[model samples]
Every structure is written in C-alpha cells, then in structure tokens.
Target: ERAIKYLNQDYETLRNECLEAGALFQDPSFPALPSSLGFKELGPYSSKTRGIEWKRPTEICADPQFIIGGATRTDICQGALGDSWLLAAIASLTLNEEILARVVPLDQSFQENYAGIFHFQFWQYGEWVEVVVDDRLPTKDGELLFVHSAEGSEFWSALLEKAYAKINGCYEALSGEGFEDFTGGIAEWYELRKPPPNLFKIIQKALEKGSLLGCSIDITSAADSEAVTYQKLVKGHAYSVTGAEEVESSGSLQKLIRIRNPWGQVEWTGKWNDNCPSWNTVDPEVRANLTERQEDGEFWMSFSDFLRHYSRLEICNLT
Candidate 1:
C-alpha cells in the first residue's frame, strides 16, 4: 500500500512509490475527519459539530473530472471553510502556468492510478513539497463542504484543497499568510481601511504588471453602514483583485477595479455592478469589457469605493 511519508520527503520519490504501489494514499500523520476533530477545539471540523459525511470524489460524481486542462480563476470555488487566502492563491495560480504547475502536478489524477489517490505540490519556504491524499472528502448532505468547482465534477481544486488540508493537519489549520506559502512570492500587505499614499497608482501598476492581489473587508470598521452596506459588500470577506482599469467618462478618466469572491457567486449589487447605470457612462467597448451579467461573484467598483470597502490588500509580487 502507498503510505504518505514525512512532510518534507522528496516529491518525486514519494509520487513514484505511490504509483508503483498502486495503493490508496493516506497521510498517516493526518487523521480523517471526525477523528481530526480532536486536533482543533473551535473550528469547522471541531468535535462539537455533527451530521458531516466524508465521501470520495467518485461517490460525489460517478465520472469525476480532475481538471479541464488549463486552470482559470473561474475554476476555483470557495467551500464552507475559512481558507479564502488559499483559494485566492489558487486563483492566482490559474493566471500563470509555471507557478500553477508547481502547486498542482500536471501528471497525477484519479484515472491514472485508479486507486483514488491524488497528489499536489506546494512551494513551502523555498522548496516544493508534494502532498498526496486519498479521494475521500468532507461533505454534508451529498455536497462538498469546503472548496469545490462550478461543474461539481471538477475535482482538481477540491483534491488540491484536501492535500493542503492534510499537509497542515486539517482544513481549519489553513488560515492567514497562506497565499505567499502557496505561491512562493514576496507577499506585500497593505492597510486600506485608512488612507494610503498613492493607493490607486500602486494597485493599478501592480495589476498592469500581472501581480496576484487579494483584499479583505476591515472587520473593525464593518460596523459602519456605509462600509458594510455601501454595495452589499460582505464584512471580513476576502476578494481576489482580478483587474484594474481607468475608463474615460465625458472625456474625464475614472479609475475602477475588478474583484471576485472565491465563492464565485455573491457579488456587489451597487454602482458599476452588472447592468448598473455606471456602465452607460463609460465607452461602449469599455462597458462591454466591464459588464459581466452572470452571478459569478465578479464585479467592478470605483477606486474610491474599493478603498472605502476593503480594509486590507495583499499583493504577491512574482516579478
């Protein structure tokens, strides 16, 4: 049987041995769900909770799909866990092939070994760490509990999430400062709850150069009605800054920013939102680029609004 070794074991050896053994892979150190409950006193998988069903990918989808070849931000969907930073990292990975392949090994899948074992590699510190895990996943009422995909059958994100959970001990163990650990980039964090110097210029330049960015609502200031409900923006929620732009309205330029929730659905319902009046003010082609009618958690906001709503911004600079 293929058994998971220590965390820092060589990636190739661990993977090859698993393939050769043709056995189900399970990290001996990381216990399964309910048993893993003992590790954390107050979190999603805590012992106090009940009615969770741990299942395999095949059980969820008869013919499960691991990945759709190339990954995209839309491919990631947040789960019931509080690992938005990790999800944001996954989305960022989708933007770059080299960085993504480093985390998600291109060669392993459920169909390859047919043993319900999968592997994912993440950049830890300065080394690449490969984490293998079984297909068994945490679910409740026939649905995946944490992170999943839009098509339901796509299991890459879910499996990667599982492998990561295993590496860190449990799902709840994945919390803050995870994005940098996953991407192996210098993480630059900024406080935007209050004014910052040249914030728009800084973010706009970063997006232009293809920096991975994530922002969160300031929980402390969320008590204010304008800060919380300005656009139905959720408090203390992490959002991926996918793009930034400056559009011309009446020959005057207005700066805007685009963001997506890892949930891939709940979005801002105010100005610059889907079909909002703000779109009519911008050029048709610009509006076309900005307008996304799907309820897929993507929206555009004025630079001022972005700073007003979001408390913190994280930028992982690859270059």
Candidate 2:
C-alpha cells in the first residue's frame, strides 16, 4: 500500500462525512437509474446524478472542498481554484493545522476507512462489475494504480486502476486544469472539419493572415526556419512523462504515456508495447486491464507516428 497508513484512515472518514452529508444514493445497495438525470439537491450517489459530484478516495478534489487529500487529522485543504502559481499559498496553508480543520468538517470519524463505501461500476464485455474502495488513501502518486503496484511503486499504480473507476465523460486538451466548461473549441471543430479544402482554409487563414492573428508568420518559408521545423516531431496526439530506464536493446527506454480515450483508458506502446523487450514491460496483467480508444476518447499517439504525420513543425513554449 505504499501509502502512509494514515491516508487510508483519513480517506475513510471523509467518505463517511460525505455519506452523512447525504452523498449516498437513495438506495446505494443496488444500481438503478435515477428519477432525473442531473439533480443537485438529492445529492450525489443518487441514480439521477452523473458521477460528477462523487469523489473517490484517490482523486484530487474528489471531496466537496478538494481538501480531501491533505496531511491532517481530517482532510485539511485550501485554495479557491486549483492553482500552480500560488505555490506559496499551498505550502503555507498546508501547515495551518488549526485553521484547516476549522474550515473543514471532521467532527466524526468512520470505523476505519471501510465503514463508508462507494461502488464504482465498470464495463467488462457487456456487463459491469462493482469494485469497492475501502476509503483507504494516499491519494499518493503512482502508489496504487500505475507502476504495477510494484512495492515501493504503488503511487503510479492507482491511475492504472482508474479505468475501473467512475470517470467524467469528456476529455479536453488539458485535463489537470479542471476541464474547462468552454466548449467553443468543440463548436469550432464542427465547422472546421466540414471538408478537405474547408479544413485547410480554416487552419491557413487563422494561423497565416500575416500577424493579424498575433503570432509570427513565415510567408516566404525560409531555408533555416524550415530546417528547424523539420527536426521537431511528437508522436501520437498526447504523450506524458511517467518514468524511464536505459534498455540495453532500445537505446534509452523512456516511459511515455497516453490516455486510452476520453473515457479514461491509458496505455504505453513504444519500445514498451506490452513487453516487447525494449520497454522491458512491467506486468502483462496491467496491459490487459486497459481501456481502448473510444469516441470521446479518440486518444492515440506515438512519437514515431506523430513525426510521420506532422512532418515539419516545431512548437516551443518559450519565444
């Protein structure tokens, strides 16, 4: 459980508090459709609500206040909106033991982390199986879902378990940014993907118009600029840094990751395509327990394939 023992104990309490606060479905013992599709008052766990309101023990911001994963007697947390810039605020507020508890409610505790439970249903073939959470938590990274739960590598193991959990139905360009509500990009997609030439016009006109779009434009397509662009290539649509090691056969083995689909399936298919020796793959069981790319999840990319598709292109975050 690479977890701190305390994380599990703390997570259970928070889960129960949620239940006490009317989070459980009217009849959680079984699975059934709700009377309405999106009701807020009946609270979560009700068949009527989408799984949005429910938070799992391992999820960040899965609790009502997003303070469910802090180090404290109760899950002490702060921050109006999740922020990366206010790092100082996170550090300072994290130590305010007295303040956090008062702000958060932990007046009661559960009989360990299992007293309060939530059942998440996942599709296997055409049926669903209910996986249970003991309220045990670390909310620790790679601790329980990704790294094949490799003893000290439990933090990375939990994400591997995400497919079996209740996940949001949408996937956007950025996920950690709380998934913005603006679907304008989507609306634009509908218009842009109309036809072959139509798509080309939208891209060229928007990106080209000679600085009118507030970006540098290379109308002449100079020799030096083309050379620089030709060198940059990203495979697949998305790639993430997980961890890596040097493989004797495949040069340097880098563990790059990709989401299975918008539905939350993930896989690795590089030198590490399910144990091809190059990846020195982990466990076969992990690959089998994955989600395939789907509609909301058309998520697939490979640095190899990526370079082949977008031949000459370079994107640098810094000017």
Candidate 3:
C-alpha cells in the first residue's frame, strides 16, 4: 500500500517540491573517549607551568602552546560514516600544527577553493627542518571530521604546491621531514616506553545472573561482601565507569569496587565470572542502581570467559 503512493505523484510536481543540498555529509559527535590513555615512563602528568595537581583522565593538559593533546598521540584511522577523503586530510596533520588549518573554514590558509596549506616543523639532528605538504590533499579521509569535498581535494593538492614553495626546501614535506634523525637518536617518550595495548572486551551480565551490590570486601566469604584488602594495580593510571557510580575507588564498609585488573591482560586470572562467581552474587535490580560498570578497563580486566559473570567487587587504594 505504501508503494502505491509514489506512483500517483507527477514528475514535474515532485521536482518543484524538492530542494538540492550542497555538502553531502558531516561527521557525528565523537563518542566519549574512555579515560583516553596517558602513558608515562617518568615525570609528573603535567608540565611545570600547568601544575601537576590539575592532571586529568582525558588529557594531560590543554595549553594551546603545549597542545599536549591526550596522553597518547592517537591516529583516529578510518571508521566514522563520512568522507574518508576529508578525514585523511585532517589526520595527516594530526601531530603537526596544520591540523586545525586543514578544515575549520576560518583557517587563514583556507579559501573558497580550498587552496590552503600548512607547514610542519620537524626536529632532525638537534636541528629543525621545515616540511611541506607535498600533496595539496590531506589524502583521502574519514570520521568526526573530514577533509573538504572531491573538488576540494584536487584544489587543496594544487595549493600544497604553492605552500611547498614557502618552506625552505621545495620538496614534499610529508615524507621529507627527516624522520631518520631519530633512528638511533634517543626518543624522548615513544622510544622510552611501549604504548599500552588497545583491547576491547564485552561482558553481558544476564540480569538473570545473581549480580548484587554492597561495599562488603570479605569476598572469600559466601555472603554479600564489598571491602577487600588494599591491592595496588597500576600506580598512575585511570579507569572509567559506565552505568554505575558517579565516583570510583572505595573501601571498608563500602561495597567493594569492581576493578578489572589494571596490569592489562598480561596479568590475568579468571576470578570474576558466573561459573567462577568470585564476588558474591546479588539480585541485579537491588544493586543495579547502586553499582557501576567501568567505562574503560584498560589494565584491569574480567577476561576469564568462564569467570566473566562475577559482578560485585571491592577495590583497594582508591585514587
């Protein structure tokens, strides 16, 4: 019956009622990043001028000069449903100053024709070598933000040629930045430590499963327990929550926290599942609102497929 309605419409009348759109798409809001990782082998979370106490989970600091970004300099590769061509353009400049200049319409380099380009300063052999956008385009892109349109891609490429001239050496800056400088050179951080792994696990706690809430930590006991002895996981790391508490880390007389081990997976033992129900069970309805699930487990985990069902837990050393 719904198909019959379109057949009655006149072609000219339908065209008159329609409106043409210019840009085909825009990206959706980025999903809340879970405690966006902050890795460190040494030094306080913040720089001297920013004050260490202000350190946060999502980012180390937001000082424009520092542009410290989050703990990790992430490359948000292809995924979101928009133009991949545009997204690559943005990501290409990710670690460089030109990132914001590529889009944002107001960038000084941006023009109606997208004939805009940005420069990147690279460090080589204890010296700075300026690199240029060998290609005007940021490379075909995707997600949260994209490069310009197809016509924009070509126009941007041509602009890069002119921008390249502005650089000291008229060569492709994208690959021209002497990356080999750090080959044997000490890397301040990326070389100092390996980044934490990006792993994802999903646990669907059956409401039918006996998952309850409480701060009792006598987990060894077969009763409603929450308080557990203080056990340190990661010294300076963050964990987030989903549908539970507005706060995290508690103990003694408080319902034990459900901490997935923070050492990541290298330190794993299936201690909290239904088949292994390490933590005492509770009627989910009774504790659902009272408890919370971690937003991001990071180092801590509940991977023992067999022990994943365990719910209640008391965390030690509240941060």
Cα lDDT of model 1 by residue, 1-319, tens digit: 2333346554456556767896655546554556543245425566534667778887887888888745678878897676788887777667766667666766766676556666777666655566777778888788887788877788888888877777777776775443675566588888876656787888877776667888887555525422445567866667888878889976889888888888887788866888688788888987886666887778888888888777789888875
lDDT per residue (tens digit) for residues 1-319 in model 3 = 0112111332223322321333211111111111111122111252311221211111221211112232111222222122221222232222233322322123222222221123333333444343333122221221111112222122232222223322322211222111122121231111112221311111112111211111111134433222222332222121111112112222212122233221111122333222233333444554444433332221222322212323322111100
Cα deviation at 314, candidate 1, in Å, is 1.5
| Candidate 1, residue 307: how far the Cα is off, in Å | 1.4
TM-scores, all candidates, are: 0.85, 0.23, 0.22
Q: Candidate 3: global Cα-lDDT? A: 0.23
Looking at model 2, which ten-residue stretch has the lowest summed lDDT?
A: 178-187
lDDT of 2 by residue, 181-273 (tens): 211011121111123444323333432321011011122343333122232312222211111222233354332322221112233333334
* Separate clash counts for every candidate: 3, 27, 49
**Model 2 TM-score, 2 decimals:** 0.23
Whole-model lDDT values for every prediction: 0.73, 0.26, 0.23
The per-residue C-alpha lDDT of model 3 at residue 110 equals 27
Q: Please report how far candidate 3 places residue 132 from its true position, in Å.
A: 1.5
Best by TM-score: 1
List where candidate 2 sits over 4 angstroms from the true fold.
Answer: 1-178, 182-271, 280-302, 306-319
